[PDB]
PDB file of C-alpha atoms in Angstrom:
ATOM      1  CA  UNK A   1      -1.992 -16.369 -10.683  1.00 25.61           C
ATOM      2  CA  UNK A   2      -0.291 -14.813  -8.119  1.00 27.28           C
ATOM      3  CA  UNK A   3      -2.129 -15.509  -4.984  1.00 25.89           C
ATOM      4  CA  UNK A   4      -1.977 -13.903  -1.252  1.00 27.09           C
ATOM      5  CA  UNK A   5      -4.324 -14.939   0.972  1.00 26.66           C
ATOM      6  CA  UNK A   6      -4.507 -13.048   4.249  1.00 27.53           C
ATOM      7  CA  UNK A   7      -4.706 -15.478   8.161  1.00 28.55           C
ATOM      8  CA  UNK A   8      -5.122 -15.167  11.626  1.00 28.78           C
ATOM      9  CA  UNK A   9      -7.371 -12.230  12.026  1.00 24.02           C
ATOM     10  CA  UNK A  10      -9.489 -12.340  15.050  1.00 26.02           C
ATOM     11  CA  UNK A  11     -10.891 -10.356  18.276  1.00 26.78           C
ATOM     12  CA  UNK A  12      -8.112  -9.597  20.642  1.00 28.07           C
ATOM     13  CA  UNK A  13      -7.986  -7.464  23.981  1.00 27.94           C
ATOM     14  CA  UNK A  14      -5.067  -4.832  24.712  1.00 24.86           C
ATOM     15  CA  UNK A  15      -2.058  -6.294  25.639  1.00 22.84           C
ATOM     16  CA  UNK A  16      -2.592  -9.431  23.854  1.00 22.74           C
ATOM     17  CA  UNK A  17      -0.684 -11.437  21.190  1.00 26.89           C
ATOM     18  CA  UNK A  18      -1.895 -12.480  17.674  1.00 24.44           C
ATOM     19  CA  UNK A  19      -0.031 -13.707  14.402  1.00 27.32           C
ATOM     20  CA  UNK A  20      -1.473 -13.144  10.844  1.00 23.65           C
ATOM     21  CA  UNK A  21      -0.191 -15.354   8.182  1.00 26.06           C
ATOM     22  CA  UNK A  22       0.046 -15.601   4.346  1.00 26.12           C
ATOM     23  CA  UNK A  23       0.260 -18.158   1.874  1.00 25.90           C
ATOM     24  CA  UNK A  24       1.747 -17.141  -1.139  1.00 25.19           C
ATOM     25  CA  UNK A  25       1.804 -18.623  -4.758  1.00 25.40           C
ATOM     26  CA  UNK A  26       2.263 -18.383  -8.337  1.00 27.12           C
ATOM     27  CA  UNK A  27       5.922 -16.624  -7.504  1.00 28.36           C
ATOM     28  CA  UNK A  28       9.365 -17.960  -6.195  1.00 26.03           C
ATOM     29  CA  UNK A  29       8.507 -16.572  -2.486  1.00 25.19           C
ATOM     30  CA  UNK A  30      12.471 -16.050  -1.789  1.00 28.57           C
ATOM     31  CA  UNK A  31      13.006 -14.312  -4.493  1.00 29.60           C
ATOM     32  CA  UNK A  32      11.177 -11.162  -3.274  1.00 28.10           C
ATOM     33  CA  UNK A  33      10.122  -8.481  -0.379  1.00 28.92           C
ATOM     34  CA  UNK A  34       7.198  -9.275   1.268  1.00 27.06           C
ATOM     35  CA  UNK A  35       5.142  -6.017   3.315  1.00 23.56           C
ATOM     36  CA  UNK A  36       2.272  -5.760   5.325  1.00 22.28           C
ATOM     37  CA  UNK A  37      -0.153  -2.654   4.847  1.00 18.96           C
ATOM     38  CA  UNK A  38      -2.899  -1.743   7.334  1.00 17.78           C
ATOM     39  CA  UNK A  39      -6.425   0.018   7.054  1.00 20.09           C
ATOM     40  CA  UNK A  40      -9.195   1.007   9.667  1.00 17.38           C
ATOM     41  CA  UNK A  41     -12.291   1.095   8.571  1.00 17.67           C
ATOM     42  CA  UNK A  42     -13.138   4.515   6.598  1.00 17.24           C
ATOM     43  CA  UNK A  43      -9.184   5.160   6.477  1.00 16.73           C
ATOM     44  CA  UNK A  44      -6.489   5.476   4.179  1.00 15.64           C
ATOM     45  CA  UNK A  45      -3.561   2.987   3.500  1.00 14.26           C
ATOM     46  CA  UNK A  46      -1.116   2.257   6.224  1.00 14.43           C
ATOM     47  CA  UNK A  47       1.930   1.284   6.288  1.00 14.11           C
ATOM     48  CA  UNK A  48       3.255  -1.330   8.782  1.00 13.65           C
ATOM     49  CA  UNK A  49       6.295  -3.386   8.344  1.00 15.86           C
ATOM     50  CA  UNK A  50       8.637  -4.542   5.563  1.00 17.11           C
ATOM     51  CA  UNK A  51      10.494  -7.615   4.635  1.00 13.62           C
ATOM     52  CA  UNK A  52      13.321  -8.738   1.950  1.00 15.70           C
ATOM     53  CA  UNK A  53      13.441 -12.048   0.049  1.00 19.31           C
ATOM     54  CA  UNK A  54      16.201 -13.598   2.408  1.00 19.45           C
ATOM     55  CA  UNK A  55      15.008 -12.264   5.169  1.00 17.13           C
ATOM     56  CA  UNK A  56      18.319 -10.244   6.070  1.00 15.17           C
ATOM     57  CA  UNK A  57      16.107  -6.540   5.775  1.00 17.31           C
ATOM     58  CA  UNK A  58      13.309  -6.091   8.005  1.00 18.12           C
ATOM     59  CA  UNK A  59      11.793  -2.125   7.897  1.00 19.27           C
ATOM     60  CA  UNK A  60       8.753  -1.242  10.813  1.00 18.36           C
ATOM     61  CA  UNK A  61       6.798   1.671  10.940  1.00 19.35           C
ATOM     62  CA  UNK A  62       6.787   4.239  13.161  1.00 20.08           C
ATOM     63  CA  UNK A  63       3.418   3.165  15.252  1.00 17.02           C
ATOM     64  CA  UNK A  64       4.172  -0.250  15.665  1.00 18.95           C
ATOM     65  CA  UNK A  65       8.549  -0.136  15.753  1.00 17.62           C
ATOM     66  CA  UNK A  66       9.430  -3.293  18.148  1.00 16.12           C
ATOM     67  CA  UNK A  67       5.668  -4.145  18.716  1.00 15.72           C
ATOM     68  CA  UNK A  68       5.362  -5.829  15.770  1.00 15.14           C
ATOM     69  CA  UNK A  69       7.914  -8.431  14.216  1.00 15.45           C
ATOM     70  CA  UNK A  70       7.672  -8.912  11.095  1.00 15.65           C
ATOM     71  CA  UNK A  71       9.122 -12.366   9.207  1.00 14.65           C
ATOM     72  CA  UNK A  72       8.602 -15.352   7.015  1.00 14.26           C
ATOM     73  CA  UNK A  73       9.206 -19.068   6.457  1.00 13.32           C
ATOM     74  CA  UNK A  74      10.564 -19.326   2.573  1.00 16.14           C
ATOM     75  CA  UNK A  75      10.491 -23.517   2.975  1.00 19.79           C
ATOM     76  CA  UNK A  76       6.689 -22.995   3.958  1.00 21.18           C
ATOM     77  CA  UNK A  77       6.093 -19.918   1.403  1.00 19.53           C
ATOM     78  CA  UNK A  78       4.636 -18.391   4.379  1.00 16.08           C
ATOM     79  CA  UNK A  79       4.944 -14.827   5.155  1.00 12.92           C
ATOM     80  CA  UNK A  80       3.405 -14.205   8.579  1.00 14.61           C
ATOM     81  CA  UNK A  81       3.292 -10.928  11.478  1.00 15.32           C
ATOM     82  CA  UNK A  82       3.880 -11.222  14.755  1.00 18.27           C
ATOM     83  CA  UNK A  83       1.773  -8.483  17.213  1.00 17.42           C
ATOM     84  CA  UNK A  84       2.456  -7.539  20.666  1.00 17.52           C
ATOM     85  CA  UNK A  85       1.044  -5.142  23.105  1.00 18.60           C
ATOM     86  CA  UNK A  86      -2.583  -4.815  20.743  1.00 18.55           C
ATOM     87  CA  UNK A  87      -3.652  -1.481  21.178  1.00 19.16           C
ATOM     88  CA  UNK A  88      -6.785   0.147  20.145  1.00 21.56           C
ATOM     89  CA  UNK A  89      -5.482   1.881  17.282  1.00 15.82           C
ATOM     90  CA  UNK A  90      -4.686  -1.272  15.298  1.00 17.70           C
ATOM     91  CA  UNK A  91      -7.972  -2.456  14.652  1.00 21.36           C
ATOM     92  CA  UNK A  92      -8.009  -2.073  10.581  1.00 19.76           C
ATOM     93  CA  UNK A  93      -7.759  -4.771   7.883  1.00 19.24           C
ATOM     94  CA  UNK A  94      -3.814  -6.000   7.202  1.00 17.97           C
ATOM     95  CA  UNK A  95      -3.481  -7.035   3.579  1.00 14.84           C
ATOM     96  CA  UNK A  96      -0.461  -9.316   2.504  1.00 17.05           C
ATOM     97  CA  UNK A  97       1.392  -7.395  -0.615  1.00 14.63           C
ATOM     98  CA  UNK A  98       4.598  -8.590  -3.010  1.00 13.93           C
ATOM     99  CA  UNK A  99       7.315  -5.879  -3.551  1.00 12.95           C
ATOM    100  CA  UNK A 100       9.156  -6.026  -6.762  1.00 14.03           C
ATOM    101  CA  UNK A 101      11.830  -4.131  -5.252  1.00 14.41           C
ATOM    102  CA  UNK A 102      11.630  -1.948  -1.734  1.00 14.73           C
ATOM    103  CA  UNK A 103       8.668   0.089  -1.628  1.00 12.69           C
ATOM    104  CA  UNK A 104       7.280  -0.919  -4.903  1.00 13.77           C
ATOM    105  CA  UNK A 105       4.019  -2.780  -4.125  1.00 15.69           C
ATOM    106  CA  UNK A 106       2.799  -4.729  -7.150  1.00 10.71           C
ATOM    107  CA  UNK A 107       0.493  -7.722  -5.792  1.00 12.62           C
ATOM    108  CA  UNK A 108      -1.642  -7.297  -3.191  1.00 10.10           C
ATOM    109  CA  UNK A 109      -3.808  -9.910  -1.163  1.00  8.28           C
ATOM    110  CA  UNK A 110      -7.847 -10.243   0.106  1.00  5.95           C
ATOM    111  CA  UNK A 111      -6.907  -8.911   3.426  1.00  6.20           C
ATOM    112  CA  UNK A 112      -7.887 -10.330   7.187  1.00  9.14           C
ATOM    113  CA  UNK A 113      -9.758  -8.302   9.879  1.00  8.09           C
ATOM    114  CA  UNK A 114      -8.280  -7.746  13.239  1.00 10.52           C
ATOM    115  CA  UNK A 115     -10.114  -5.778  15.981  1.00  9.34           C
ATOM    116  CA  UNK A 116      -8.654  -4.699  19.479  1.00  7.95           C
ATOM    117  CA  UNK A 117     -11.589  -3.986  22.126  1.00  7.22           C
ATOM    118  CA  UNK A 118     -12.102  -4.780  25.862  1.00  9.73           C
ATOM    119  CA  UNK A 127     -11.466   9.157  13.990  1.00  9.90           C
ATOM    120  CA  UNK A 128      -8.792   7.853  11.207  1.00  7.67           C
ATOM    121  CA  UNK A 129      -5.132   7.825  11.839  1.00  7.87           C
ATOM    122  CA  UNK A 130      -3.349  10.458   9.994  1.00  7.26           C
ATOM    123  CA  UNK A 131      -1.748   9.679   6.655  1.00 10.25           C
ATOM    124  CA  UNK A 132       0.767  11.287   4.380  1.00  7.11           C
ATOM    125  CA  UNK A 136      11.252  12.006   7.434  1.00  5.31           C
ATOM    126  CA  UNK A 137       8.952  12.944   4.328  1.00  7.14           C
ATOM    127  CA  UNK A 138       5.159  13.164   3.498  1.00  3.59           C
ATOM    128  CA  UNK A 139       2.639  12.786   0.512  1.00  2.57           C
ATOM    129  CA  UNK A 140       0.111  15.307  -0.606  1.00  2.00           C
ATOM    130  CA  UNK A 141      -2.916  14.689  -2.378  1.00  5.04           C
ATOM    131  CA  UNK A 142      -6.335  16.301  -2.843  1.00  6.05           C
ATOM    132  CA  UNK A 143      -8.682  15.227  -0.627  1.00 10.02           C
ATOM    133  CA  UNK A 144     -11.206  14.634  -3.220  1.00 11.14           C
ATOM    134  CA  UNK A 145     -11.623  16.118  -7.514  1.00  9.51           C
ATOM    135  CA  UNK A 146     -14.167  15.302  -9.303  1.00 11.43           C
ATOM    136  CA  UNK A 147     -15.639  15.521 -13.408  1.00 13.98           C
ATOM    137  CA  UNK A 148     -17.562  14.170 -15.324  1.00 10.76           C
ATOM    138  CA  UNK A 149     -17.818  10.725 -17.913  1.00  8.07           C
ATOM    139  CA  UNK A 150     -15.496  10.857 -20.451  1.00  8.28           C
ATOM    140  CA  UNK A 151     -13.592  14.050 -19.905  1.00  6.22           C
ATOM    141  CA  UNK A 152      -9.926  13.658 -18.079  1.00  8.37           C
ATOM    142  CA  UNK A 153      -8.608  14.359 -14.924  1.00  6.56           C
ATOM    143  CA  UNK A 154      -5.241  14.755 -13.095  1.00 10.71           C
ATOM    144  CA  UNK A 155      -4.696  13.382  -9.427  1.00  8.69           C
ATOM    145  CA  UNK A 156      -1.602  15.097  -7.380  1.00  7.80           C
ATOM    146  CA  UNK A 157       0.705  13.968  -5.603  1.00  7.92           C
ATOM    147  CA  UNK A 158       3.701  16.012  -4.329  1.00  5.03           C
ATOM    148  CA  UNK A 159       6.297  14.831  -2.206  1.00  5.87           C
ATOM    149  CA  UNK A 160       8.058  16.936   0.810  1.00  5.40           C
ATOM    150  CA  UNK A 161      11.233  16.320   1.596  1.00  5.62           C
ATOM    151  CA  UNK A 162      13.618  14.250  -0.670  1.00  5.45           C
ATOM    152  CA  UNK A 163      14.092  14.152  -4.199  1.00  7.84           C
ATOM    153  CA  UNK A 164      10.910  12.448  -6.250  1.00  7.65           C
ATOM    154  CA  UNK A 165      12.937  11.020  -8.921  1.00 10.50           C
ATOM    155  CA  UNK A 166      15.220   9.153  -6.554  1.00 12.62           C
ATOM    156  CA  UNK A 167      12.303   7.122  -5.526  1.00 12.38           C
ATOM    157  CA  UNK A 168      10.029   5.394  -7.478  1.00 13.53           C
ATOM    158  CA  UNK A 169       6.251   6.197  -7.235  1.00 13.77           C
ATOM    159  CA  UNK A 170       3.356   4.258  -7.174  1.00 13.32           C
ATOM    160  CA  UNK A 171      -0.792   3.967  -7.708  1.00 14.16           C
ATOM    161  CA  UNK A 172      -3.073   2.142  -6.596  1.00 14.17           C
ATOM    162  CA  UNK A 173      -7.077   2.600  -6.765  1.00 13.79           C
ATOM    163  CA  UNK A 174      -8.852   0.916  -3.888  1.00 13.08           C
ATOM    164  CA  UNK A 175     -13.151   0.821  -4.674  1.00 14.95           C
ATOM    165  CA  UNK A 176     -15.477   1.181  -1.359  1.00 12.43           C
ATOM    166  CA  UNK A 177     -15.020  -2.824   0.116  1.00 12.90           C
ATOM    167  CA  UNK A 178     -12.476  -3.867  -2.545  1.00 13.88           C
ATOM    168  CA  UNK A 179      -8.830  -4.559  -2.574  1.00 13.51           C
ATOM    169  CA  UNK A 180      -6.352  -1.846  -3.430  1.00 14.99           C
ATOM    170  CA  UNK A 181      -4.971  -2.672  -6.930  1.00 14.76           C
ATOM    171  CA  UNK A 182      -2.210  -1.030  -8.954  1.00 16.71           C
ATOM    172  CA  UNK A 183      -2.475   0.936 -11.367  1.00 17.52           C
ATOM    173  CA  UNK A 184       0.434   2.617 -11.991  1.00 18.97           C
ATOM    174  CA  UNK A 185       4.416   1.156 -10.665  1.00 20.97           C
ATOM    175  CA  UNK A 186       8.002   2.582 -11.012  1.00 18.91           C
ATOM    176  CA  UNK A 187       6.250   6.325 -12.115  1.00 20.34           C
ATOM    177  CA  UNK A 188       5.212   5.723 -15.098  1.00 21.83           C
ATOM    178  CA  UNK A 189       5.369   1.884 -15.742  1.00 23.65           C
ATOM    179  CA  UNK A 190       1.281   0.222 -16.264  1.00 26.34           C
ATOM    180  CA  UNK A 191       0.671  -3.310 -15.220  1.00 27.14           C
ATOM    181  CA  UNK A 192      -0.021  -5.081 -17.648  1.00 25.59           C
ATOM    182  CA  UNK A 193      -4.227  -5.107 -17.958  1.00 26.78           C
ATOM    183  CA  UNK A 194      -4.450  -1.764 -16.374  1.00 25.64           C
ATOM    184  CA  UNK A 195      -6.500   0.457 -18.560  1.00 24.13           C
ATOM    185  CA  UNK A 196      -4.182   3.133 -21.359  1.00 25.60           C
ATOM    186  CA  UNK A 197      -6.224   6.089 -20.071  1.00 23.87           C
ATOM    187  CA  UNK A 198      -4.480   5.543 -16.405  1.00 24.22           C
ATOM    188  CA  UNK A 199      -1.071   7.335 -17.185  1.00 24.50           C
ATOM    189  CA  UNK A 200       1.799   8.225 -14.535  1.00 24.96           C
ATOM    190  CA  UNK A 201       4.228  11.345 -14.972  1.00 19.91           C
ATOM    191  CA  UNK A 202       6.497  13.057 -12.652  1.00 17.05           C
ATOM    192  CA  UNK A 203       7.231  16.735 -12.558  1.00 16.39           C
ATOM    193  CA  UNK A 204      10.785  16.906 -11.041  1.00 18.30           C
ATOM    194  CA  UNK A 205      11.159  20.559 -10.459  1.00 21.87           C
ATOM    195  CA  UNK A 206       7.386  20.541  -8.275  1.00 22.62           C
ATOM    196  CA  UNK A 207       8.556  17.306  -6.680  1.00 25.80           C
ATOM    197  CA  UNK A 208       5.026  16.002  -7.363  1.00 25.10           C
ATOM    198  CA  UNK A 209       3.844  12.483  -9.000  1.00 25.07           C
ATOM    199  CA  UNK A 210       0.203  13.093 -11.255  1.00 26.43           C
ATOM    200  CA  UNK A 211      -1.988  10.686 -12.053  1.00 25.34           C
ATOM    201  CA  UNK A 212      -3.890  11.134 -15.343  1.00 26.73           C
ATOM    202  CA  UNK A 213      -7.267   9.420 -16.295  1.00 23.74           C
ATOM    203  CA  UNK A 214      -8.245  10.176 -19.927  1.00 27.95           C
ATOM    204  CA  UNK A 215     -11.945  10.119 -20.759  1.00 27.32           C
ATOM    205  CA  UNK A 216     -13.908   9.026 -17.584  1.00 29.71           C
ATOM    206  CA  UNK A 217     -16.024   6.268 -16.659  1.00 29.97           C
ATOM    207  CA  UNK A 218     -18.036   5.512 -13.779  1.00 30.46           C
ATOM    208  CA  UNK A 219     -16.391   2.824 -12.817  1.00 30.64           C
ATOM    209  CA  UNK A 220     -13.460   5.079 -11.952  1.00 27.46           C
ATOM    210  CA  UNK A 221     -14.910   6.296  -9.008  1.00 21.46           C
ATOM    211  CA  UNK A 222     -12.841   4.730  -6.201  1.00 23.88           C
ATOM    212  CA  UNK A 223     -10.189   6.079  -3.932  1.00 20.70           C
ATOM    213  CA  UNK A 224      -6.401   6.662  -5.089  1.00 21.61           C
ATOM    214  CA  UNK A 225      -3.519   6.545  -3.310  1.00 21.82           C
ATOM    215  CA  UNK A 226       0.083   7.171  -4.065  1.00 25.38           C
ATOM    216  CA  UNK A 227       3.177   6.029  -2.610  1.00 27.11           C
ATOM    217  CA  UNK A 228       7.159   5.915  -2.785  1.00 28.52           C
ATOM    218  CA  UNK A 229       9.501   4.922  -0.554  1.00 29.40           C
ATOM    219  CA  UNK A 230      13.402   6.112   0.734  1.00 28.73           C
ATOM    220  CA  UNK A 231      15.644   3.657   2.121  1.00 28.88           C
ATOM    221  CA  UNK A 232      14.145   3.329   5.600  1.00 27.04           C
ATOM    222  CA  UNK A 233      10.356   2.914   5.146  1.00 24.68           C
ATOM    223  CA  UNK A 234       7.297   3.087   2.725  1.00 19.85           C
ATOM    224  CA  UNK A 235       4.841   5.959   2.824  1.00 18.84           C
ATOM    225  CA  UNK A 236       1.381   5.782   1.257  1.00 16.95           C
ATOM    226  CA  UNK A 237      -0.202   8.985   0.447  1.00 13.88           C
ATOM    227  CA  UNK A 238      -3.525  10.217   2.254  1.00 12.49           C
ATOM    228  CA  UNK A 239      -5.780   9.517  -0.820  1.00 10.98           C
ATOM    229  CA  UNK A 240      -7.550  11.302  -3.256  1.00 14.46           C
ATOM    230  CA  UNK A 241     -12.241  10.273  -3.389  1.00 12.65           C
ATOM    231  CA  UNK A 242     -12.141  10.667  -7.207  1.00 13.14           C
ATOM    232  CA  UNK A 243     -16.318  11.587  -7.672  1.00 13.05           C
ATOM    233  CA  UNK A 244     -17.758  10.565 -11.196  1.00 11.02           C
ATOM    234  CA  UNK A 245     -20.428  12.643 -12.001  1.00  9.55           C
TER     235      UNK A 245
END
């Protein structure tokens, strides 16, 4: 029921203003932390900016600190993005998410296109590691990595999401090892603390499976999403 649906995307020239917007539902909208994640075409997740229930907390990413103003309308249930000084790199498709708590993504929206015009941006304080593509075959299991640089793992929860080629990233797997509700059993989430890594398991295959996967925690400043791991069915 949950619903966030994605506004405002359009074509833009540099230097030029533009605000995205998005409606949410089927939640109290105050009573949570709004973000807004980024992705150019054939590119991983992005970070971009970060927002608490009351408003009070607002986190931006390193690309876009001061160009971009994040902030919402809690009377209107409106979460919307202000954008400055549209450069070239910021073409990609902004998605609306819900955060359960800071840097724990659990709903996620449609998405809205926005292109700046008159190679992918890289990915990964601290940085993620993943493969950059495993594969197997049907009904056999595989492990994804994810290991974390700098800061402790366990301090921060962990998160999956699979994203298929032209859908919406879902999650899979919140708080390390927690499963949304209607996420498959086989999808299971473990930590190894002394590796600082985060694995993601998928018992007995499908080929459905095949879609991207990306990880991602969080520390107290800003959200990181890992580069993503092509997971090939054969």
């Amino acid at each position: 029921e949950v619903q966030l649906l994605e506004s405002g995307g359009g074509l833009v020239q540099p230097g030029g203003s533009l605000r995205l917007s998005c409606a949410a539902s089927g939640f109290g909208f105050s009573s949570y932390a709004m973000s807004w994640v980024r992705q150019a075409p054939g590119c991983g997740l992005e970070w971009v900016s970060a927002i608490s229930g009351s408003g009070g907390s607002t986190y931006y990413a390193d690309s876009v600190k001061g160009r971009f103003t994040i902030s919402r309308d809690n009377s209107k249930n409106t979460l919307y993005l202000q954008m400055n000084s549209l450069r070239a790199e910021d073409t990609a498709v902004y998605y609306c998410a819900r955060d359960l708590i800071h840097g724990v993504t659990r709903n996620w929206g449609q998405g809205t296109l926005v292109t700046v015009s008159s190679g992918c941006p890289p990915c990964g304080n601290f940085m993620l590691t993943q493969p950059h593509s495993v594969s197997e075959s049907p009904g056999k299991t595989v492990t994804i990595s994810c290991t974390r640089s700098s800061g402790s793992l366990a301090n921060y929860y962990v998160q999956w999401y699979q994203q298929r080629p032209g859908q919406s990233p879902t999650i899979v797997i919140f708080a390390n090892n927690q499963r949304p509700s209607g996420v498959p059993d086989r999808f299971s989430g473990s930590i190894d603390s002394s590796s600082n890594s985060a694995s993601l398991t998928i018992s007995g295959l499908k080929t459905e499976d095949e879609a991207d996967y990306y990880c991602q925690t969080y520390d107290p400043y800003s959200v990181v999403f890992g580069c993503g791991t092509k997971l090939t069915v054969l």
